[PDB]
Ligand binder design. Structure first.
Ligand code: NA
Ligand code: NA
Ligand code: NA
Ligand code: NA
Lengths: 293, 296
């Protein structure tokens, strides 16, 4: 049976402060530890990517759940998706509010409806049927995010391969700062924000949402592998095309069916981390290979 | 410069009794002929697919705009998207209510905003801001679909086009499926799934079970194949082939390559479709019941 792997990513975004890397690092390391621990007891791929995306949602440092950017009204609106590479089962929520873990809600859509995607008010309806807690907007808005906005006036993801050779992906975000109300970016859109398939691999993406959607980056990446490119070569084709075709920047993380993995990005910085073989590989900048504490 | 062409379709579901067949064939002819009228008259492939689908939305016999299927909670929530192959420029909307024409809001999303996709409350407010009229919910509603939602206690409309300047586009629009959960979103607004447009390959607009079409990203898979060497019909067959086996989904698509070539195919029992090219109307519902007239 396969040796399991988890890869995580924060945003494929701008350059970070020298002091705050410390802080961002430990965010990647932590969510990846939650993912690799899960695989380390025969959790499934969906378990790992969800608990890993769960970690970063909870973390007010990352642009997802608590920590989400604000829309044009000072308000957090959230998208996410999760996908099962064996049978292509999937779940996604878009433009949801007053909840803590949009990724946990995306799994609930997937596991307990015959639908794959719920939006806005029907998505709240679904959450409360599932007895998901309402929290105050305040509890998701950093003092920080209000400043990022008023000047103008991040994504998190995970891929894993488990003990049985299943792949999966999770991606969650608060979107782009100042976005129109009800703007949906790539995150809850299969093939854009992520894709996962046992006959190929899994991908979660980050960066400019409209650009990712337009070139179908996640599924695109995996086409290149399907043609026998390396996971390195594949991700260099998709992001390079995204740049030359739509002037969009981003980054991505991928695991192929046989367990090869990479983080590549064309933006300034894509914070990432990976666990495989009791060893952890951490970076923010264009990499520590280190024991699993 | 190329010979312009539009292809239009309706839902990809089951058997259709002869009495409904006629108005459906009727409406598909208005759609093909409206879109073509724009292409003949110098217009863009984006303009032209916007054309074919507004006719399909305003026409009651098709699950998009007027005559959209009802969600579990007796309301209309509509999905639409539109793409320009020129630059891959796109606009989209999900869970829109109480407007006549979702595809127009979608194009307004491609042109008037920095985004490609708005939904529900957000999409309603942009529609206020662009001067989209706020039309009472019940006029979208129809007895056929009232009967149907009652009995439950499915349709999509689309077009692709090639223009006389070489450019390609698709538009897709839907009400979803019968007794869907509130705020359910299917394939029809998701680029790569409910449709894909790329001047360097061609354009495709899908029909059928939204959830499957999303799982396999049906429209972009037909294109990958057309890139690889496959003819439009082989690519149709194979992508359509894979949704059936891998995820046990049925549906359809229309496609039109950057070379002039077009096809319409389905794995559902039926799919109302018409193409217009070189001064003729093509149409059909069930496999090779092909009839061609001359289009004035
Ligand atoms: Na967070
Ligand atoms: Na990002
Ligand atoms: Na209609
Ligand atoms: Na349909």
């Amino acid at each position: 049976h396969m040796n399991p792997i988890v890869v995580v990513h924060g945003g494929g975004a701008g350059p970070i402060s020298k002091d705050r890397k410390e802080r961002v690092h430990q965010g990647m390391v932590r969510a990846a530890t939650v993912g690799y621990g899960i695989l380390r007891e025969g959790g499934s791929a969906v378990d790992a990517v969800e608990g890993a995306v769960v970690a970063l949602e909870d973390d007010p440092e990352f642009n997802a759940g608590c920590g989400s950017v604000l829309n044009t009204n000072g308000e957090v609106e959230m998208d996410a998706s999760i996908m099962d590479g064996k049978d292509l089962s999937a779940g996604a929520v878009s433009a949801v509010q007053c909840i803590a873990n949009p990724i946990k809600l995306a799994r609930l859509v997937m596991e307990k409806t015959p639908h794959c995607f719920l939006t806005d008010q029907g998505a709240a309806q679904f959450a409360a049927a599932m007895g998901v807690p309402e929290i105050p907007g305040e509890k998701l808005v950093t003092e920080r995010n209000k400043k990022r906005l008023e000047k103008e006036k991040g994504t998190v993801g995970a891929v894993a391969l488990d003990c049985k050779g299943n792949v999966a992906y999770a991606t969650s975000t608060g979107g782009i700062v100042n976005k129109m109300v009800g703007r949906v970016g790539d995150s809850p859109c299969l093939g854009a924000g992520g894709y996962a398939d046992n006959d190929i691999g899994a991908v979660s993406t980050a960066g400019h949402g409209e650009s990712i959607l337009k070139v179908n980056l996640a599924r695109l990446t995996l086409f290149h592998i399907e043609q026998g490119k390396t996971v390195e070569e594949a991700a260099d084709l998709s992001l390079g095309y995204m740049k030359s075709r739509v002037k969009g920047l981003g980054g991505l993380i991928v695991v192929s069916k046989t367990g090869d993995w990479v983080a590549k990005w064309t933006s300034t910085s894509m914070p990432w981390a990976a666990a495989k073989d009791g060893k952890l590989h951490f970076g923010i900048d264009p990499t520590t290979i280190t024991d699993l504490p």
